[PDB]
Amino acid sequence: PDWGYDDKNGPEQWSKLYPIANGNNQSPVDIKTSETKHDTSLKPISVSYNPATAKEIINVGHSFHVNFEDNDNRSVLKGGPFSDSYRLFQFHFHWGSTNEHGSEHTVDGVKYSAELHVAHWNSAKYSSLAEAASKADGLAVIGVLMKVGEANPKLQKVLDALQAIKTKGKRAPFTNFDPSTLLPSSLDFWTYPGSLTHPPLYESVTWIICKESISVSSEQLAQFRSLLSNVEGDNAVPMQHNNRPTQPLKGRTVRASF
Numbered sequence: 652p653d654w655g656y657d658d659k660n661g662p663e664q665w666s667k668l669y670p671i672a673n674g675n676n677q678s679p680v681d682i683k684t685s686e687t688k689h690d691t692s693l694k695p696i697s698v699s700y701n702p703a704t705a706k707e708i709i710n711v712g713h714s715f716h717v718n719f720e721d722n723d724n725r726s727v728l729k730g731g732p733f734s735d736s737y738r739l740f741q742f743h744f745h746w747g748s749t750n751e752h753g754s755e756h757t758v759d760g761v762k763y764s765a766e767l768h769v770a771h772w773n774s775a776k777y778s779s780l781a782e783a784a785s786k787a788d789g790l791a792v793i794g795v796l797m798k799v800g801e802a803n804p805k806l807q808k809v810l811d812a813l814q815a816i817k818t819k820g821k822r823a824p825f826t827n828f829d830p831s832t833l834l835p836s837s838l839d840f841w842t843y844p845g846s847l848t849h850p851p852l853y854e855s856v857t858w859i860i861c862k863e864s865i866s867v868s869s870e871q872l873a874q875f876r877s878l879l880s881n882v883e884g885d886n887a888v889p890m891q892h893n894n895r896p897t898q899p900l901k902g903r904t905v906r907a908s909f
């Protein structure tokens with residue numbers, strides 16, 4: 652695949668290998684609060700995750716993933732703009748080289764420190780994640796903006812797991828964990844049709860952006876920034892940043908549930 656976040660193979664170059672990069676439904680985007688539209692049809696989002704579905708943590712080089720068993724409908728998202736239930740498959744984070752600016756989505760032109768993404772795939776429609784992945788209604792991602800301030804105690808279990816997957820390709824059992832514990836107290840949101848924020852960049856995602864942010868301290872962020880992109884044994888190359896610049900809206904509408 653050979654793509655990255657460095658000057659050579661970064662976001663500004665992705666178009667070269669993946670034309671969809673210049674599509675009309677690309678993510679992330681800037682959410683202008685004055686132009687959002689209240690949609691009275693939106694229902695509250697309901698998350699129902701089973702902790703025993705947590706399975707492993709893995710270093711994939713450009714970031715780390717927390718994977719969940721997705722053979723059943725034990726952990727699902729429902730409500731919001733959906734008629735069907737979406738099966739949780741993973742959560743991951745996005746951050747930047749500085750503690751102040753590292754989110755993907757921005758609000759009123761304001762970039763936050765980091766962003767949590769909780770991904771699900773349409774089990775009511777497709778057979779597998781692989782199938783669902785390039786379809787318009789294939790994936791649902793919840794994005795939660797993180798703002799540097801006080802340390803957040805709910806992140807602890809994830810941070811301690813990091814020691815075991817220091818380098819690319821390392822993986823470790825990660826179990827008994829309910830990710831809904833990471834979401835803000837209120838679930839009011841913004842939604843728009845978009846895409847995967849990194850290659851292959853399929854325009855298959857229905858974004859759910861939470862209106863309320865959660866905190867994190869600069870030392871917590873420094874722990875993400877300390878993981879390595881190289882394989883074990885090689886020279887150390889830190890995972891400095893993994894966020895893509897915002898893309899043009901191209902006439903999409905950002906709906907508000909409030």
Ligand SMILES: CC(=O)Nc1nnc(S(N)(=O)=O)s1
Nearest residue numbers: 768770784792846847848849
């Ligand atoms: C299978 C799958 O979800 N691939 C991803 N690539 N980008 C994603 S993101 N950052 O928009 O959640 S998810």
Ligand SMILES: [Zn+2]
Nearest residue numbers: 743745768848
């Ligand atoms: Zn992501």
